[PDB]
Each structure stands twice: as C-alpha cells, then as structure tokens.
Design a protein around this nucleic acid. Structure first.
Length: 49
DNA sequence: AAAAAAAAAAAAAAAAAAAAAAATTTTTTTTTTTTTTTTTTTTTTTT
C-alpha cells in the first residue's frame, strides 16, 4: 500500500527485483566509452519512498 | 551630245568546314557501431 500511495514509490526485496537492482551500479561501455548508470531501487525512488 | 551596249559595284542568298554546345546516376566498397564469445583472471563461498 505504501508503494502504491507514495507519489514516487518503489517496492523491492532485499536482493532487488527480477532484473532490477537495489542500488545504482556504474559501468563503462567499451564501445562508446559512456558511463551507463543502471538505476537501482534506491536511486529510482529518489525523493520518494 | 546623246543613246546603246559593256562592264563594274553593290548587295543578297547559299554552302562547307570547323569550332562550340548539350547531355550525363548507378553501383560497389568500407568504416563504424554493435553484439557475441572464449579465455583469463578476480572475487566469493566453503571447509
């Protein structure tokens, strides 16, 4: 309910969700050399719950 | 001195050579980017 009720809200387990992380992870693309930041629950639910 | 004939001048039309003009997208390559994979190496877990 809290996840559905908060303006910004994400519900996740301790070990993250199915193909989603609990916290952000930064990687470097070998080809484009960009910094790809996979957003976990903590970063995705920024300013919310 | 004038008229008739001859010849020349001017002008216009036609032809030949030579310089000018017009027309003129498709096919193949290949580089970069992205993904895939094989091995090495590093980290984590277990005893």
């Amino acid at each position: 309910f809290v996840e559905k009720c908060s303006p910004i809200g994400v519900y996740t387990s301790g070990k993250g969700s199915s193909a989603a992380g609990l916290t952000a992870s930064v990687m470097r693309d070998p080809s484009s050399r960009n910094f790809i930041m996979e957003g976990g629950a903590m970063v995705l639910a920024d300013g919310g719950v």
